[PDB]
Amino acid sequence: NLYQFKNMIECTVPARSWWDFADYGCYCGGGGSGTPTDDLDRCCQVHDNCYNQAQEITGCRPKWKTYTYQCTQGTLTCKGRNNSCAATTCDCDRLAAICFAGAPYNDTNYNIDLKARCQ
């Protein structure tokens, strides 16, 4: 779920607040359209698409599904104790957290005007 995804980000990106990823570019946080503004935004586009795919699974709600994962000594892992829905969203989240850690953060793409720049 969202609470868990926030914790994953805190696992892989300790030197930053999760809020910094909550409203960035055209895809990070609320949103889902237009041309990704940079690498970090592309990380979020893939994550948004991954959630859309997971939602095709009966009764699977990415934002609310609680999965089992672990964050220890620099390693993020989704456990085999997850059903199909849990396993899918956990993977969506894990891949995004990893993506966020390797992408440059441009302060100038935080909180941009979606209606004018994400068409």
CA distance 6 to 100: 12
Triad 21, 57, 10: Cα angle to 5°: 25
Question: What CATH number does the domain containing 34 carry?
Answer: 1.20.90.10
Q: What was the structure determination method?
A: X-ray
Residue 2, SS3? Answer: helix
Q: What is the resolution of this structure in A?
A: 2.0
- Give me the amino acid identity at 74: G
Question: Which of the residues are catalytic?
Answer: 47, 93
Q: Which domain holds residue 23?
A: 1-119
Rounded distance, CA 67 to CA 88, Å? 9
If one counts the domains in the chain, the total is 1
Binding site for Ca(2+): what residues are annotated? 27, 29, 31, 48
- Residue numbering of the annotated binding site: 27, 29, 31, 48
Query: Which residue shows structure tokens 């992408």?
Result: 103
Do 101 and 74 meet the contact criterion of CB atoms below 8 Å apart?
no
Residue 113 corresponds to which amino acid?
Answer: D
Distance between CA atoms of residues 55 and 19, nearest Å? 25
Q: How many Cα atoms occupy the beta-carbon half-sphere of 12 within 13 Å?
A: 21
| Sign of the CA dihedral running 79, 42, 100, 30 | negative
Separation of alpha carbons 43 and 86, rounded Å = 20
Percent of residues in the chain assigned helix, strand, coil, to nearest 5: 50, 10, 40
Q: Which helix (H) or strand (E) holds 115?
A: helix 114-117
